[PDB]
Amino acid sequence: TGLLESQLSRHDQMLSVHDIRLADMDLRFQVLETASYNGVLIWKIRDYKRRKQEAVMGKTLSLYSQPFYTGYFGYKMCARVYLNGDGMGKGTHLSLFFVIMRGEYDALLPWPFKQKVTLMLMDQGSSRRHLGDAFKPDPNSSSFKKPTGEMNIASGCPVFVAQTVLENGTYIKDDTIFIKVIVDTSDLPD
Amino acid sequence: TGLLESQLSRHDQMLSVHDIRLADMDLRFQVLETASYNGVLIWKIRDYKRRKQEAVMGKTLSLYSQPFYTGYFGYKMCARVYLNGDGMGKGTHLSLFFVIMRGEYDALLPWPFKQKVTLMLMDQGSSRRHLGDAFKPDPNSSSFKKPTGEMNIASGCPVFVAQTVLENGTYIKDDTIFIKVIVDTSDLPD
Amino acid sequence: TGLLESQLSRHDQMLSVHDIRLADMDLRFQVLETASYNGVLIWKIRDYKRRKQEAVMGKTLSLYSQPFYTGYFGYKMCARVYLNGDGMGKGTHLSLFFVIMRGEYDALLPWPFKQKVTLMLMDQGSSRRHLGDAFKPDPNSSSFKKPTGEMNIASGCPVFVAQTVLENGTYIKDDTIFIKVIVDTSDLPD
Amino acid sequence: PIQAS
Amino acid sequence: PIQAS
């Protein structure tokens, strides 16, 4: 019964580990199924009301997109949103940022990152009047240095869109917003 | 011993859930390994004879292809085949249909779906004499509405190829046929 | 008590089978996560010093890359490296080879394989003087016949780069090398 | 373009 | 191009 209990304990712990690995693979699948390799990210954010509230309460201040890429072995990048705003936009705006991540082929890519970036909030209405802004990465920013940790300092627009505009327009629909990031890729090796 | 039996029963249950979950990611891997994001589907159907007999016996009337896409965040679509035929081709033809599926990014895409679609069954013989049929989706068919359920009503060709032709030609080889769908992606966001 | 031991034994067995399948899926993820469909392979090889030594000792003579493809439903290919050389380069060279693998859509592709193939070792130093060698396949080699087994005979350059050259230059940063293979796809009718 | 049954 | 061993 000592032995019987030992083995039952061993199995319970292994069954716990297997539940963890299975849950981590569900997340890995989701990342793969939403990957893109042409330098264009479409990010679908569901449960806006609940999530916007979790940023006001200070539970979850910001959200990250899945990674996306300039090519199959290009820059690894992603986007960061603050539904209740950050910096000069905290509490008054939606804040949107661009993030360089450490990719496996960084030793083969030009540094600093110099590709043109377009941030966008998609209009789900018939006008299709998308909000957007672009910039050319400043080469002196540590935002575009060759990554040394998992991600570089985010860079973008603290006052992208005022919350009042975003909530009274047609950007929100079925409690969902879409963010689009377009990285120009037409001056790099394919 | 009642406690030992209870924990054994609890582990057996969790082992079954894991076995289901493992089997289900096997399918997910096969869907991901055959995904296509350039608007062209190649569909490999193995075990023709057995699956044809299954359709004749009424075991399995139709088969679905894996999904394919117009872009990384575009329309989700698939193909449907009736090996023993459907509608006006039941018993005499192979029927082949196009299916619009509910896509995660539907709120961003034009509806109704208006892209040219070509349905083909490939010639595996040296002639490369593929059977083909293109069509312009009729903007009023419910087959091309913004999906409300998982799949719209399929649309296509009930009398695509007569079975006698199919089985007397070079279309079958090692008990395998190949179906190709081409959706034209030239007039859309790139 | 005999009954309790029986069920523990069954559970242990099936936990062992799940531990393998999970290990297998981790590998399958990594294959998918590094897959490519435009005819260009980048192959990152870490732990060069330890792996070169494994070849000198005959533990692991050669390493294979993950598969890559000419299109979503095209040729399936990969690369084979000997860090301590093969044939007329054994012990003096790094040998780099190209492999045709059996692919799911082989019945649809031209055979023999005839696309131009470029093998390269990337220069991680700031000069970017990549070492490269191209070739047109010989239609009579069995290396480019329609596969009958998992892989054909490898074919390439037994004296691609001298080990002294390789290790004295700037091809090895952080005990890593990068191998690039470029297959020309611009003649392929999809 | 006919529909399925 | 040459084959392997």
Residue numbers in the entry:
A (entry chain C), B (entry chain A), C (entry chain B): 377 to 566
D (entry chain G), E (entry chain H): 36 to 40
Pull text from the paper.
Since the putative TRAF-binding sequence in ORF3a is conserved between SARS-CoV (PLQAS) and SARS-CoV-2 (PIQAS), and generally conforms to the TRAF-binding consensus sequences, we hypothesized that SARS-CoV-2 ORF3a might also bind to TRAFs and thereby induce NF-κB activation.
To investigate whether the SARS-CoV-2 ORF3a N-terminal region containing the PIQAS sequence is capable of binding to TRAF molecules, we crystallized the TRAF2 TRAF-C domain and the TRAF3 TRAF-C domain in complex with a 16-amino acid peptide from the N-terminal region of ORF3a (residues 30–45). The crystallographic asymmetric unit in the TRAF2 crystal lattice contains three TRAF-C molecules forming a trimer, while the asymmetric unit in the TRAF3 crystal lattice contains six TRAF-C molecules forming two trimers. The TRAF-C binding sites are not fully occupied—in our model, each TRAF trimer has either one or two peptides bound, which is similar to previously reported TRAF:peptide complex structures. The ORF3a peptide forms several main chain and side chain hydrogen bonds with the surrounding residues from TRAF2 or TRAF3. Of note, the side chain from Q38 in the peptide forms multiple hydrogen bonds with two serine residues in the TRAF-C domain. Additionally, the P36 residue, also highly conserved among TRAF2/3-binding peptides, is in proximity to other hydrophobic and aromatic residues in the TRAF molecule, particularly F511, with which it may form hydrophobic interactions. Crystal structures revealed that a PIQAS-containing peptide can bind to TRAF2 or TRAF3 at the previously identified peptide-binding surface in the TRAF-C domain.
